[PDB]
Assembly symmetry: C3
Homo-oligomer: 136 residues x 3
């Protein structure tokens, strides 16, 4: 269905995508499994515009997003398979991040309500999360 139908089912809408901001917290993988069941994936962030929408909408509560490493010693990528713009990302990480604390932080969340808000954390940490699916 369309914008009205999705918005009237609880989805947010912004720049050609719908977003589901979860009620309850999950691990990164359990979140992604839930998003898949809603025909979605944990959100990518493919513009500063989208970053601004998302950090504002997350209300200062940490939220898992769809950035994860390709294995525990791998490079970051978006689980929805859109291209990961490394250089753009420096504008979105909290100062000092990603810092791979304990060598065990392989997923990312929007930690605070700021443009510089991404932190890497243990994927088994439980947070609210953001699903994204395209407006088609």
């Amino acid at each position: 269905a369309g914008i009205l139908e999705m918005v009237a089912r609880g989805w947010k809408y912004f720049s050609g995508n719908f977003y589901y901001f979860s009620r309850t917290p999950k691990t990164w993988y359990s979140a992604e499994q839930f998003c898949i069941s809603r025909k979605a994936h944990l959100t990518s962030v493919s513009s500063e515009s989208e970053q601004k929408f998302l950090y504002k909408a997350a209300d200062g509560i940490p939220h898992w997003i769809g950035l994860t490493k390709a294995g525990s010693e791998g490079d970051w990528y978006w689980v929805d398979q859109t291209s990961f713009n490394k250089e753009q990302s420096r504008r979105f990480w909290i100062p000092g991040e990603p810092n791979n604390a304990g060598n065990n932080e392989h997923c990312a969340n929007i930690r605070v309500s700021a443009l510089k808000s991404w932190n890497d954390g243990p994927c088994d940490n439980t947070f609210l999360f953001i699903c994204k699916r395209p407006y088609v």
Copy 2:
């Protein structure tokens, strides 16, 4: 008011009805009293289409619906007074349900995010709940 006004007050909309998914948990009766104050009743489920909308929207959190027995030794009915389709219902109960545990389970909730998701429980159990009112 209309769809936009109801959606912009927090109501969901689907197939000619509005739905209010509660913030906080109540007993079955306290939920129904709240729904009445919002010109609604605890939701009926009168199609597989509606069941699908509701279990999806309930996000895997148990939610009271408007099915209750006519007294503690009575037959199931919908509190909004729409006809209860016994045979259709077998498609919506969790396997084993209704099981009338302790002979004291006289109200029903959508317990999980599946098509087979209804469980009978004690009406004094406190859960989130779903109000329904027609789009007129």
Copy 3:
């Protein structure tokens, strides 16, 4: 942006204003600081119509509104700077209120889901809150 865009970002809409009903509780000042960051202020209540919308939408959970005293021994005013109609207000206070308990209740909240629902409380009490911003 317009009604659809605001509603699709979580804002409620009623009689020419948008409203943000918070996820988490804050002190009165921390709430107001958050509302300002969302181009809003803690809500004023400038009609019985608006009072009805707000108490209904607050779902029986106490919510901070934008009424505060001009200093701890001052008169009530709306932080968004709309005129405070003293005489109208008597229709909206809970019976007995405002009672300035402990001589330390200098902010107001909608405490219950009724037309007579405002209570003065300590501004350092933590409640959910309501931001308002005009539809322009």
